Amino acid sequence: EEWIREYPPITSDQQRQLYKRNFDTGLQEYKSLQSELDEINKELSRLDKELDDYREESEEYMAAADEYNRLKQVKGDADYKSKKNHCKQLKSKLSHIKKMVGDYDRQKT
Template sequence: MRSDLMCQQFWLRHFLPVDGTDDISSSVGGLKPRLKDYDTGVESGEDLEDEDFYVLFPSIVDEQERLNYKREFDQEHQEYKSLQAELDSINQDLAELALALNQHPEGGPQFLDAMDQYTRLKNLKKSSGYQIKKKRCKYLRLKLSHIKRKISEYDRRP
C-alpha cells in the first residue's frame, strides 16, 4: 500500500496557499450589473502534474494490490463526496442569491438581506479555509480518477 506520508506531501506541495493571505475584498457598489457575468467559482486552476499519481499508484500487478487500491479509493471517496457537496451547496446558494438580487428593488429590505448573504458567501469563497477545501476536493478528484483508471486497466487485462 502507498504511504500516507507520500500522499500528504504531494497534497501539501500542490495545494496549500503559498502566501498565507486571506484576501477578503468587498464589492458592494455596482453589484447588479456584475451579476450578469456571475460565475460559480469553478476556475480551471493550475495544471496538476499527473506523474506524481503514477509514482504513488503505478499499474496494478496482482489482486492484493487491486484490493489495496480499492480500499484507498473507498476511504477517500467519502471525503470527496462530502467536500464536493459542501462546495456545491455554497455555489448553489450564491446562484439563488444572485437571482434574488435581480428580482428585488435595489435598496429594499429583501435586496439588502440578499446582498448581505451574497457578500458573506463571496467572502467565504475567498477565505483560505474555503480555498483549501476546494483544492483538496480537486486533488481527491484527480487521485480518485487515477486510482479508478488503474483498477479498470487491471480488470481489463487478458
C-alpha cells in the first residue's frame, strides 16, 4: 500500500533501467535484512532442539532456557521489530517496482 507516486508506470527504456538499478539496491538491503533477522530464529531453533535433548534438571537445560529467553526478548524489542517492519516495506516496494518493469517489458516484447 502505496508506491505508484514514486514509481509510476514506465514510459522509456532509461526510466526502466533506473527502476532496475533501484530494485537491485533495494534487493540487496532486503536480503541483508532477511539474514540479520534470521540469525535469531536459527539460534532459537537450535536452542529448541537443545531443550529437547537435555534433562530438565541439568545446568545445560537451564543455560539453554536462559539464552532462549534472552533471544525472545531481543526479537520482541524495538530494534528487531522495526527492522522487520522495514523489511516488509522494502518487500512491498520491490514487488511493485518488479511489476512496473514487467509491465513495461511486456508491451514491447
